[model samples]
Target chain A: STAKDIEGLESYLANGYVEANSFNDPEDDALECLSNLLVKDSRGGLSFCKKILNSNNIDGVFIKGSALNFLLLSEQWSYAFEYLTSNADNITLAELEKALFYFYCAKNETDPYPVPEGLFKKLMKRYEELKNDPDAKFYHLHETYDDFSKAYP
Target chain B: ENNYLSVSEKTELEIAKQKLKNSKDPAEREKAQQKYDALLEKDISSDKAVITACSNGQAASAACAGERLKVIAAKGYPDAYGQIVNLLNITSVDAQNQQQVKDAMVNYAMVQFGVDRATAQAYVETYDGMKVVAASMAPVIGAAAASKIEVLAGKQRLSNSFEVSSLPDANGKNHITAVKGDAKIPVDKIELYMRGKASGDLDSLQAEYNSLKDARISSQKEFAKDPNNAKRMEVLEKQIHNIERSQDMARVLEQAGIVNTASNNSMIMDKLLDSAQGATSANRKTSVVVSGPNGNVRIYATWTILPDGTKRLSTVNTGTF
Candidate 1:
């Protein structure tokens, strides 16, 4: 059945589908409802895509995040790197020869683009501070990469 | 017409006659019959003495006969003699004919309570079947009773040893170092060992793959006559898949440090990952904390499904050391 055919969906507009107090427009309200219904994981997204595909008007759906990573890394990048490189990639030697000046912050939140500009700056500062220490500390970046790969991929 | 034999003489004659009839030797049978006749002759004198004493009505002689009858009643024919004793006590000598009473008591005791005939007859008819029933039922009842006793005893044993906690930590004092032994193998050394062994196995697996490829090419050439030999191609493909699966498993084992060349530290990392995953799947409601005594901890926060099928983290703070 069409989304418009359902009595609940038809009366939803009148029954405050887009509450004037909450949303600016019906499109914004619909987006909010869709986001709330769609789960963040791949399986949930697949299920959401299936539901949309069942409708006559909705024939296609695009999933982002880890799901898009496969396509983008394989087709767009042509397998340029064997594995994922996070924020702690290339930095200057001068920037590395410092200790106790940088704060190490681990980003816990998920994002479509994991390598954001803010994360890049934080990781470079942390690497420099660790490299410059008299004790010659190693942060074990591979361990963290392994964890993130398992969690996201 | 001298029918004045004592009861013992009469019994002796009957036994002699049975022996004479069954005797295999002629001389033995003749001797038995002669002995039986002699016993009868001797019983005639005792019987005349008993009759003369009874006819005199002498109290002492009558008392002697009663004593003899009592002996026969107690020992020879207990059931019939018992009846005789009862009748003798009730009936006076003048009340019934003395000779008739005497004859009746003697005949009843000898004929009715002569031997254990009833018991012998019963054993002849049902001996085999009854013996089997007795033999079978005895062991069955014994075994059932014994098993029931053992079960009850086992339950008591379980009750005595019942406890909520696991077995006592006997090796609590034994350090974790005991698990890996005295050598301090670093994780980097383990990784190097794993990589080297894995490279070696990969080379061997590649060689095997080449061999199989060569075999397949050779087989295809032979199958040129029947170019569309689907069965041969399917079998070859199946073999290739099997080889690939084996190679994959071998690589996994080497990478996981299960091979002999892999160091202990690499094995420990594999074990830690397995333990973490196991702890995660153990409970849906409780958040599991994977930790060691050395203050290392990793936690996976618990997630719950709401009534509307939405998933959410139940708690933000999972675990702490």
Candidate 2:
């Protein structure tokens, strides 16, 4: 639905989609709504996040990465990965930094959502490439890649 | 349940105290006075301090910490609520681990709850999932932490065709592996699994796009000739615009993030989201039947508050529509 602005978006998120004025997907709209909410890190954002992650059914990668990063920050990586991979085959992988983050956070820490060695190997491959790329402050992401890595990663 | 006052008792005690103090006739106030007096004895005016002492490795507490731990499990700060319960209930954990558990609570209380460092620390910790949630999740999802992390984990597990089988090593140790239908999928399979690449085949969705796109072109040309058909023209123009959108839910792999765009980018899914309108939202939860055009199963989440003082995505069952 066309939220036009934050007020409209906020209500739509807590209540789910209401109208689809000009935007294409209300769920995606919900995703974007969450993105805007998270970036601002304002009120009703976390609540909106809890609501979205709980009821969400995104069969896409882009949304997953953004949501994944958000979840990571909240220390909800286990839950995030579990949900993100809900439909593994269907979704693509555009997310970076999330893997190193798992180990970054997990490090044998309170049970992390364990990734496969093979995948971890692959993740590390990507993580390795970017871990050194100027923006590797653990969470101190490289501003240069902010737009490309739009995910809070 | 014993040795500690009930949550309601605290409030009741406060109310009764107020009633007796304000009563014009002290005798009449004696009604609530007795109840207050009775509850006050059990109400450890310093449960917080007591909790801190116990959590911080105090000798008597270390001694009866087991028994007293249960009290903190019941009463005390909501932030460490689950951790308290978790510490007491966990089996393999015993006296030796008690100090650690206390330390975790202390750490959580201090780090998250801003509990005075003196109160939050003890010998040391049980950083296990339950412990973590109780100690930490409380501050985020609420003292009402994960109602059941394992169960939710398992749902994603069984459907993924699996189990967290701990294969013991020669030392009789166990390492957890996600065994799926004996596929022996490793636990580290997460990132790749989440590496959401769009599958090439979103046939039905693509078909819908094609169908709509043509209709839009057809509508636009008609609009130009008959601009006065305002409403219809607007819809037709809008429909085409929506169809041409690059964010089809079914199959665009990259260059789009859920944050910047809407569902699978497909309007197909938007209708699904719209269907949730007018659904039930009461007592603070949203429960609705989102029966969309697709012959697919859909799921919606209702947040919950657990007795342990944790709030999280408690349940997620498939919906009828």
Which fraction of the native contacts appears in each prediction? 0.00, 0.00
The candidate scoring highest on DockQ is: 2
Question: lDDT (CA) for every model shown?
Answer: 0.31, 0.38
Q: Give the per-residue lDDT of model 2 (tens digit) for A1-153.
A: 223435545545544332322112344455556655554553354455455444454333334444554554453445555544443322223345333333343432444345643554444345546556322432233432342233223
lDDT of the structure predicted as candidate 1: 0.31
- Per-residue CA lDDT of candidate 2, range B93-150, in tens? 3345545454544565565656477644321111122234343442222211222222
Clashing pairs in 1: none
> Where is model 1 more than 4 Å wrong at Cα?
A1-72, A76-123, A126-153, B1-305, B308-317
Q: Which ten residues in a row have the lowest lDDT in candidate 1 chain A?
A: A97-106
State residue B210's C-alpha deviation in candidate 1, in Å: 23
